[PDB]
Design an enzyme around this catalytic site. Structure first.
Site, PDB file in Angstrom:
ATOM      1  CD  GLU A   2       8.667 -17.350  11.839  1.00 35.42           C
ATOM      2  OE1 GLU A   2       7.664 -18.096  11.779  1.00 35.42           O
ATOM      3  OE2 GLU A   2       8.783 -16.403  12.657  1.00 35.42           O
ATOM      4  CG  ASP A   3      13.698 -16.466  11.171  1.00 34.17           C
ATOM      5  OD1 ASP A   3      13.761 -15.794  10.120  1.00 34.17           O
ATOM      6  OD2 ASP A   3      13.318 -15.985  12.256  1.00 34.17           O
ATOM      7  CB  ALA A   4      14.053 -23.265   9.397  1.00 32.46           C
TER       8      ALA A   4
ATOM      9  N   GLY B 123      18.227 -18.634  13.583  1.00 27.11           N
ATOM     10  CA  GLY B 123      17.542 -19.740  12.945  1.00 27.11           C
ATOM     11  C   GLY B 123      18.142 -21.102  13.234  1.00 27.11           C
TER      12      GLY B 123
ATOM     13  NE  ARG C  79      13.288 -12.318  11.442  1.00 27.67           N
ATOM     14  CZ  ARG C  79      12.498 -13.250  10.923  1.00 27.67           C
ATOM     15  NH1 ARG C  79      12.314 -13.319   9.613  1.00 27.67           N
ATOM     16  NH2 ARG C  79      11.891 -14.117  11.718  1.00 27.67           N
TER      17      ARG C  79
END
Ligand SMILES: [Zn+2]
Ligand SMILES: [Zn+2]
Ligand SMILES: [Zn+2]
Ligand SMILES: [Zn+2]
Lengths: 46, 48, 67, 1114, 216
Positions: free
Chosen positions: D733-735, D885, D917
């Site tokens: 997630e977003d990382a 992120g 998103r």
């Protein structure tokens, strides 16, 4: 030079006596930086 | 209940007012220069 | 600040060509894309930094000690 | 090269912004203040006179700031930037000219300082004002800092634009139960005063005004208001027929059951119920007892001499409530901007001023009394230099306000706070980000969802793209790019003009109105109800757009409600746009060559009758189109450009029209945290905590909004060549996942700058705190704990300083607070050395130190420390597009894809984020990027516009890259073709605050607060963390007893209290002390918060006696 | 202050590294106190008169743009000045006047007693009285020596002209220096020779200023 520090606007070498004045001898402009130390320093680029 | 540990309804109203310890009302750090900040209870009752 | 000395991906040295770039643009007025190409950067990530990278160091040298 | 009528309007917005500036709100209101409202305030009170010595007076005449009549700008002042280093307060002095009464034949005058005003950078009176790139150098200061922020005490702060509810205006609210309060709160000069009105009960309705006792039947007041005909009240406030007939007459009843005839007694019912005049002055108890209140109750809006205006005003107000009692809706919410008026720093600093100046006069009187009390010779005495000694209350008091944010107004008895801020410089965007920020205030309690959401009326006059989460006690918005906050204009001329057009005075009116036309309301006050409303309108608007009374003084018709409004109020939002006469615009397309030549510019179209400023009301009455491409000759105006709607912050986002708005909201909540280049004076200034980046770069795709804020000359970010792929398995997630041998090549490197101020101050013992130092034991070298100084004892430039060392040595005198006596011989010299220690997880460097003197002549030392953080694992990055992120594994070089050129994607990013998103704007920005760098051209993008995507393909496809952004890649690990295509190009990833090396935190056992003796709070002080009752419950569900007793008992405050079984109470060591025993005490343990709870309780009279029993054996 | 309960060494060091802040001895390494508890966050004739004297005192202070600092030193003199009841039956002004003047002298600053006076009706004499009088009562001698080098500064700023005066300053003082060794200096209001040397170097700097505007 090798002496202590500098004005702001004068940008002039200024050595100060212990508890003398905060003014710069040349300009009436007050604030003063401290000039670079002549002593060695080490970085590692990486 | 009165087997008189308390001794009836007369203490309900203040007579001797219990001053709290200092460790409840610590004088604030003395800081640089004479006045250390008060700490509430130190001013109210000291006025009382 | 100063043009980096290599791109952030390739590793071709871009430090050099920034001078030769801008010189090549001002004198000899010539369009961007054609300029950089015969300046010798085909790969685009090597290229961005020439194209990108505003040079601040000038705008930071107004403030020097001596004036 | 004929310019296209389509986009050529673009050339407006710069010329608009070019002369009349971006941040003009804070300037104008200021420059209007110093040049005008001072000459007002003193014109209010120009005469202070005691009661004594009937011959005296003190007559002010003129006010000036910095100009004593020598040159135009003050001959000398202190340069602002240099004034920022000394902790001074940037100031220009006040100049006043006076008339005295001193001795026979004087009445003389001077030019005198009453004190000093903290003017505003790049105002009129500033030194920086109108100085080009040369003075900028010599004054050692930034060209691109927009200014408009004050500077005081050396810190750097802003007055924040403060929204306020419409003042002196009608409002009508309904509710469950209630009965539909109406309110009009009017204020000017003296006595800001509310007046509520409502129904009390059941068609029986009353005025509540806290100046009166309780209530009055509105029929009574309206009688006493000087319309005596009674039943014509009904014909007035009610209407002709409709439904309204009955609903109001029910009210009219209870007046008949009581009293009538304002000629004497009907007024008397009011003054009968007024409160007292507080003793003296009561003399007016009369039938004219209340005749005061009937013109001044609340309303200072009308007052005057005969009654008819206020009478019929209160009438027309009473109409709108009974209109509401008829049906709900058909009323006024307080939401859409036209019912709210923001207000700038201009009126603020005056209101604060005339108070401080007022107290200055009241008290300077009382100081001129002391001299004139006790006769000595014939008392004359200049009675003039005493202003010096009795001043500052004007200045130092003013600095206290402007810096702190406590405004105590005795004259209004109204206090507001949180009204200013440190202007936060983390970016060049934030510089004008704090600038131009609307702070809403009041908002009663939070629980109403009404004053929250984003109203469609907001279009283009306020940024739609940020309403961040710092809400709390208030709301925060931002202006648009094009807004001109209308100032105060004038009244009497527009009044007599309105008559000139043929409106008829209310005094002539039928006293049957509502049927005929609408009515014409100046500032919500009835005047004429003229014949032929629309023609009146078009006539008036025609005048405004050319001849007279320009900018504001908007006008709009109305239908449902029958009115036409002429609003002259100041402090109001307006916006530019083009008039279309007949089909086409008024531009005529040859006017713009006539423009960009430079002989024309802006604020010239008003005098040419092209564009003017509408208002949320006016435009609501008007009709607008988006593009010239679509017009119908039903229209009025067309917006000059659609993308003016996004704010100065919002204009950053490329292709915003492809996103879902919450992403742009988080983005306007981020980009101001992007670390950046700040300003050109960057290195010279010395700030508290200032980040900055090593190798900033222009964002590859700009926006026609960026270039006009000069955002590309101070870019914040790196431009990173970035795949979109799942890699590693450190992604999720977003990382993000970064790239070694890239990050090491100078990608995303940060610096950081901190200042440590150490003020040196002399003590009343006449003993100076000294910086001497450098102990240096054992043969010519300082102890390592010391080292990093040099001979001076102060720190030194450029030397690596490490953890527990000392970067400035400082020692206080030991006796400093003692009683100075005229007795000493030898030792004043005993010093307690308490040097400030460096503490931090990393090394750092001392780049620059500053020795100076403050304004009051006390020594000052300031050093600033720096460190360049490599973008370590765990560092928030953004995509500037709403992706927020943290980097994952930092892979080496060899790993991750490459393909044919050999390039290695630098940042590599998780795909999943885009669909959920749902933001495709970025995913276009990537294309636009790769297309840019090939042609060698910065390629644009913008809200409702920008480079058309379908040609981007053509630019790539001939140059060999896939018609859509996708391309093949070779997994670095294996070395065989990646089984699916991948999509990458340049994207601009800005790096944020929240560097991890700040935020990591740990504790073994640290200090405890004296009171609770359980660990202190947060970072800085020392460690320890929170277990909330919200959380604490968790372990109960698991059922762990022993984990709590370890947790809220052993590990926090472990404590042994000695109690006494008999008559349970605590006690120390051996004694119970309520019963002297030293026998029956039992040692046991207990949370120190619990004991503290006892000694708290038992102090208060109550007694947690502890009955005890043993654990074992029952 | 304390001693190790074991090593019996007196050298204690508070280790700031790991966010303990323990106090330890460099000798045996035993800790003195762990858990370093820290803090955080009537009716008198004398209160009336005193705090009233911080009022009236602070009043005349920033009128002369003196350091607010020095006020506290002067005030406490006033405190000690009340101890001898020297302050009772005289004009409040003259009292606090000298009370401040004696301070700003003890710091060797530039404020001249003449300037200090003109805030009032007063003759620069009644003040001259009270000052010289408290010289007796409160016993003080050595401190207050006034000298030219200070007055020229505060003068120089108000003298307009231009940046040249700094040179003139550097010029004038060396001038005034020799005049002191020229042995004409004693028995004179130092302001007199101050403005004197100022006029001198100013003329030496070829700038034309009147005699009036000087004594201004
Ligand atoms: Zn200098
Ligand atoms: Zn490359
Ligand atoms: Zn007991
Ligand atoms: Zn020990």
């Amino acid at each position: 030079a090798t002496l202590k520090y500098i004005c702001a606007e004068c940008s002039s070498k200024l050595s100060l006596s212990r508890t003398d004045a905060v003014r710069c001898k040349d300009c009436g402009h007050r604030i003063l930086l401290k000039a670079r130390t002549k002593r060695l320093v080490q970085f590692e680029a990486r | 209940d009165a087997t008189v540990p308390s001794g009836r309804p007369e203490t309900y109203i203040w007579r001797y007012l219990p001053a709290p310890p200092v460790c409840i009302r610590p004088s604030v750090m003395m800081q640089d220069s004479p006045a250390s900040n008060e700490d509430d209870l130190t001013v109210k009752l000291t006025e009382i | 600040m100063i043009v980096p000395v290599r791109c952030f991906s390739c590793g071709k040295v871009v430090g050099d060509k920034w001078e030769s770039y801008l010189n090549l643009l001002q004198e000899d007025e010539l369009d961007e894309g054609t300029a950089l190409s015969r300046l010798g950067l085909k790969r685009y990530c090597c290229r961005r930094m020439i194209l990108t990278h505003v040079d601040l160091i000038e705008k930071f040298l107004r403030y020097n000690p001596l004036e | 090269d004929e310019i296209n009528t389509a986009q050529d309007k673009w050339h407006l917005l710069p010329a608009f912004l070019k002369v009349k500036g971006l941040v003009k709100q804070h300037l104008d209101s200021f420059n209007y203040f110093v040049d005008t409202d001072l000459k007002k305030i003193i014109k209010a009170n120009q005469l202070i006179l005691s009661d004594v010595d009937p011959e005296f007076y003190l007559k002010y005449v003129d006010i000036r700031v910095g100009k004593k009549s020598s040159s135009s700008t003050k001959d000398y002042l202190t340069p602002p930037h240099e004034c920022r280093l000394r902790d001074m307060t940037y100031s220009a002095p006040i100049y006043v000219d006076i008339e005295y009464t001193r001795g026979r034949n004087i009445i003389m005058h001077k030019d005198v300082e009453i004190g000093r005003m903290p003017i505003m950078l790049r105002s009129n009176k500033c030194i920086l004002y109108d100085a080009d790139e040369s003075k900028m150098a010599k004054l050692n200061e930034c060209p691109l800092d927009p200014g408009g922020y004050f500077i005081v005490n050396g810190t750097e702060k802003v007055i924040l634009v403060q929204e306020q509810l419409s003042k002196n205006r009608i409002i009508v609210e309904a509710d469950e139960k209630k009965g539909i309060v109406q309110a009009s709160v009017t204020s000017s000069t003296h006595e800001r005063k509310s007046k509520t009105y409502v129904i009390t009960k059941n068609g029986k309705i009353y005025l509540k005004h806290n100046s009166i006792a309780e209530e009055i039947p509105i029929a009574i007041v309206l009688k006493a208001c000087g319309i005596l005909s009674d039943l014509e009240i009904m014909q007035l406030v009610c209407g002709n027929d409709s439904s309204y007939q009955d609903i109001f007459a029910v009210n009219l009843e209870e007046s008949s059951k009581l009293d009538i005839y304002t000629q004497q007694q009907a007024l008397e019912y009011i003054g009968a119920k007024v409160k007292t005049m507080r003793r003296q002055k009561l003399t007016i108890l009369q039938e004219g007892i209340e005749a005061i209140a009937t013109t001044v109750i609340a309303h200072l809006t009308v007052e005057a001499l005969d009654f008819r205006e206020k009478a019929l005003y209160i009438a027309m107000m009473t109409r709108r409530v009974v209109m509401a009692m008829y049906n709900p809706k058909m009323i006024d919410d307080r939401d859409y901007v036209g019912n709210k008026r923001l207000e700038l720093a201009g009126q603020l600093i005056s209101l604060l001023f005339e108070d401080l100046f007022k107290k200055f006069n009241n008290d300077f009187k009382l100081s001129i009394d002391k001299v004139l009390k006790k006769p000595n010779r014939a008392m004359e005495y200049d009675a003039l230099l005493s202003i010096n000694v009795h001043s500052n209350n004007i200045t130092s008091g003013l600095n206290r306000a402007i810096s702190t944010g406590n405004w105590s107004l005795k004259r209004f008895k109204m206090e507001r706070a949180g009204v200013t801020h440190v202007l936060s410089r983390l970016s060049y965007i934030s510089a004008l980000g704090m600038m131009t920020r609307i702070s809403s205030q009041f908002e009663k309690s939070r629980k109403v969802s009404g004053p929250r959401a984003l109203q469609p009326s907001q279009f283009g006059m306020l940024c739609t793209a940020d309403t961040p989460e710092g809400e709390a006690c208030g709301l925060v918005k931002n202006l648009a790019l094009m807004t001109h906050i209308t100032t105060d204009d004038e009244e009497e001329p527009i009044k007599k003009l309105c008559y000139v057009l043929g409106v008829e005075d209310i005094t002539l009116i039928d006293s049957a109105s509502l049927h005929l036309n609408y009515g014409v309301y100046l500032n919500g006050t009835l005047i004429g109800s003229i014949r032929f409303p629309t023609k009146f309108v078009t006539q008036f608007r025609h005048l405004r757009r050319t001849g007279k009374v320009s900018e504001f003084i908007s006008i709009y018709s109305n239908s449902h409600q029958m009115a036409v409004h002429i609003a002259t109020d100041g402090g109001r939002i307006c916006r530019p746009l083009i008039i279309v006469s007949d089909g086409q615009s008024r531009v005529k397309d040859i006017h713009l060559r006539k423009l960009l030549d430079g002989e024309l510019d802006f604020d010239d179209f008003l005098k040419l009758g092209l564009v003017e400023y509408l208002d949320v009301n006016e435009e609501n009455d008007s009709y607008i189109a988006l593009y010239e491409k679509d017009i119908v000759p039903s229209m009025t105006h067309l917006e000059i450009e659609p993308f003016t709607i996004l704010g100065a912050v919002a204009g950053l986002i490329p292709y915003p029209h492809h996103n879902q708005s919450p992403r742009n909201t988080y983005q306007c909540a981020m980009g101001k945290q992007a670390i950046g280049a700040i300003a050109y004076n960057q290195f010279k200034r010395i700030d508290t905590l200032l980040y900055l980046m090593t190798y900033p770069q222009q964002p590859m795709v700009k926006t026609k909004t960026i270039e006009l804020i000069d955002y590309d000359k101070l870019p914040a970010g790196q431009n990173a060549t970035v795949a979109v792929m799942s890699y590693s398995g450190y992604d999720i997630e977003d990382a993000l996942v970064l790239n070694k041998s890239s990050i090491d090549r100078g990608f995303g490197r940060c610096e950081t700058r901190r200042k440590t101020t150490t003020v040196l101050k002399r003590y009343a013992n006449h003993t100076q705190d000294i910086i001497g130092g450098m102990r240096v034991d054992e043969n010519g070298d300082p102890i390592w704990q010391h080292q990093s100084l040099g001979p001076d004892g102060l720190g030194e430039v450029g030397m690596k300083v490490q953890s527990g060392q000392i970067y400035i040595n400082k020692s206080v005198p030991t006796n400093s607070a003692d009683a100075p006596n005229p007795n000493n011989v030898n030792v004043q010299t005993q010093y307690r050395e308490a040097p400030v220690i460096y503490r931090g997880p990393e090394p750092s460097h001392i780049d620059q130190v500053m020795m100076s003197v403050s304004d009051n002549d006390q020594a000052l030392i300031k050093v600033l420390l720096r460190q360049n953080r490599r973008p370590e694992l765990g560092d928030k990055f953004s995509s500037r597009h709403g992706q927020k992120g943290v980097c994952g594994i930092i892979v080496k070089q060899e790993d991750m894809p490459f393909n044919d050129q050999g390039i290695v994607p630098d940042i590599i990013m998780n795909p999943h984020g885009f669909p959920s998103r749902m933001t495709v704007g970025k995913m276009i920005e990537l294309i636009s990027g790769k297309a840019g760098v090939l042609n060698g051209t910065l390629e644009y993008g913008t809200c409702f516009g920008g480079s058309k995507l379908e040609d981007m393909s053509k630019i790539l496809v001939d140059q060999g890259f896939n018609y859509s952004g996708k391309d093949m890649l070779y997994s670095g690990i294996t070395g065989e073709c990646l089984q699916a295509y991948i999509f990458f190009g340049p994207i601009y990833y800005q790096k944020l605050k929240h560097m991890v090396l700040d935020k990591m935190h740990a504790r073994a056992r640290g200090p405890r607060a004296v009171l609770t003796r359980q660990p202190t709070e947060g970072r800085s002080r020392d460690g320890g963390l929170r277990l909330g009752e919200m959380e604490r419950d968790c372990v109960i569900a698991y059922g762990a007893s022993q984990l709590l007793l370890e947790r809220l008992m052993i590990s926090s405050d472990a404590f042994e209290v000695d109690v006494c079984d008999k008559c349970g109470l605590m006690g120390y060591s051996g004694w119970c002390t309520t019963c002297k025993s030293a026998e029956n005490i039992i040692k046991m343990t207990i949370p120190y918060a619990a004991k503290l709870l006892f000694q708290e309780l038992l102090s208060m009279n109550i007694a947690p006696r502890l009955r005890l029993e043993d654990i074992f054996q029952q | 202050m304390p001693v190790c309960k074991n090593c019996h060494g007196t050298e204690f060091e508070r280790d700031l590294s790991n966010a303990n802040n323990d106090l330890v001895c460099k000798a045996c390494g035993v800790v003195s106190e762990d858990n370093p508890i820290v803090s955080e966050v009537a009716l008198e004739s004398r209160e009336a008169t005193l705090n009233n004297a911080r009022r009236k005192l602070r009043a005349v202070s920033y009128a002369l743009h003196i350091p607010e600092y020095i006020t506290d030193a002067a005030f406490q003199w006033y405190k000690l000045a009340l101890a001898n009841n020297f302050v009772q039956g005289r004009r409040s002004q003259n009292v606090i006047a000298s009370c401040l003047y004696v301070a700003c002298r003890k710091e060797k600053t530039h404020h001249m007693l003449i300037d200090f006076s003109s805030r009032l009706q007063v003759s620069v004499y009644s003040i001259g009285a009270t000052f010289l009088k408290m010289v007796k009562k409160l016993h003080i001698t050595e401190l207050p020596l006034a000298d030219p080098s200070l007055f020229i500064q505060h003068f120089a700023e108000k003298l307009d002209l231009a940046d040249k005066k700094i040179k003139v300053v550097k010029d004038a003082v060396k001038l005034a220096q020799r005049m002191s060794k020229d042995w004409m200096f004693e028995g004179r209001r130092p302001a007199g020779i101050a403005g004197a040397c100022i006029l001198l170097a100013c003329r030496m700097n070829n700038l034309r200023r009147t005699h009036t505007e000087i004594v201004a």
